[PDB]
Amino acid sequence: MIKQRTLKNIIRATGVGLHSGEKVYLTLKPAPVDTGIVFSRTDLDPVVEIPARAENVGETTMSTTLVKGDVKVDTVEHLLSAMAGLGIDNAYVELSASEVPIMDGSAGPFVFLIQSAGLQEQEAAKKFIRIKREVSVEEGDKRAVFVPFDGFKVSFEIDFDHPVFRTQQASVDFSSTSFVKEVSRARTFGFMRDIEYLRSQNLALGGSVENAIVVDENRVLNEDGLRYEDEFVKHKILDAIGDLYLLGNSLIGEFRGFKSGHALNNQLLRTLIADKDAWEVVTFEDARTAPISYMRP
Ligand SMILES: O=C(N[C@@H]1C[C@H](C(=O)NCc2ccc(C#Cc3ccc(CN4CCOCC4)cc3)cc2)N(C(=O)C2CC2)C1)[C@@H]1C[C@H](F)CN1
Numbered sequence: 001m002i003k004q005r006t007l008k009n010i011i012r013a014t015g016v017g018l019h020s021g022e023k024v025y026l027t028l029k030p031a032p033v034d035t036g037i038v039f040s041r042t043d044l045d046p047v048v049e050i051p052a053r054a055e056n057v058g059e060t061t062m063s064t065t066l067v068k069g070d071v072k073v074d075t076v077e078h079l080l081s082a083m084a085g086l087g088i089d090n091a092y093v094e095l096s097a098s099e100v101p102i103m104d105g106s107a108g109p110f111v112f113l114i115q116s117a118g119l120q121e122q123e124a125a126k127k128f129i130r131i132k133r134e135v136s137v138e139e140g141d142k143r144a145v146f147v148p149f150d151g152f153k154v155s156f157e158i159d160f161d162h163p164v165f166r167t168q169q170a171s172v173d174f175s176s177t178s179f180v181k182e183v184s185r186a187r188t189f190g191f192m193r194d195i196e197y198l199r200s201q202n203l204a205l206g207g208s209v210e211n212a213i214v215v216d217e218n219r220v221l222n223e224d225g226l227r228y229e230d231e232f233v234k235h236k237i238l239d240a241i242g243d244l245y246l247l248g249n250s251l252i253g254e255f256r257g258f259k260s261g262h263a264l265n266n267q268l269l270r271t272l273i274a275d276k277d278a279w280e281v282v283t284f285e286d287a288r289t290a291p292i293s294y295m296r297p
């Protein structure tokens, strides 16, 4: 059968929080069967643990954020992206501060570390949510859609009215396209104008070229430019995938985002969980017949 994966070994990384400018020490520990992904504030006494279920999501404005009480964990999307990518079911994610470190602006550093350590299969069937019906949300000109699909695939359009905006639509089937190779390296991005305002509202305090695509009026200001033709929309997919990990079970279906953010992605989540008609849980007693598949541990 398809079995749950956890970490083989623990991983320590160090970085800054993009919004906080805070030095943050990160530790990824294996977790038991049926733990799911569980974020943890080790700097607090006692320690505060927020499962990365959708129920725990807060201010979605500048990043995806987990809350319990008046304790938050900011910017989980890139890491959850990475964990989703490699099909990790169970991990604890320890932090010395409120924000998850940004590293380079992509999932790549996270995927690296996860795979250097390696994965452990566990005597327990992986549980899957199969999309069974179109489920759609709109707000103004944004839209966000699940569509049943025998596999896992993500599509995104964006429109920025911008000299730099190269391609603004992409679609990836992850049962025939390497998440690792095609999506994981896609960096977050800010606009020159936004940044000037946000710094003077104590946001983007840890932001630099070393972890973000910086865009002028006209051009990427990053000396070494883009990792991809379509990095921006490739990053949007990355983020989308993270948000979808909050289900707390992997997805057999397709997502389509149009101009969508964390806020509308999270609405889509809630609505989907609410319409029990629209989905079902499935395990597979024979991976050679299952519609999505996995990399070697
Ligand atoms: O990636 C995400 N969203 C995407 C990207 C983008 C967005 O929300 N971006 C959010 C974002 C905002 C600001 C920065 C920065 C910086 C910065 C760079 C240089 C200096 C000065 N330097 C410092 C060093 O010295 C030299 C100068 C100072 C600061 C990076 C990302 N977006 C948008 O739609 C944008 C348009 C609204 C969709 C989510 C959200 C979080 F960003 C993380 N994941």
Ligand SMILES: [Zn+2]
Residues within 6 Å of the ligand: 077, 078, 188, 235, 239
């Ligand atoms: Zn992002």
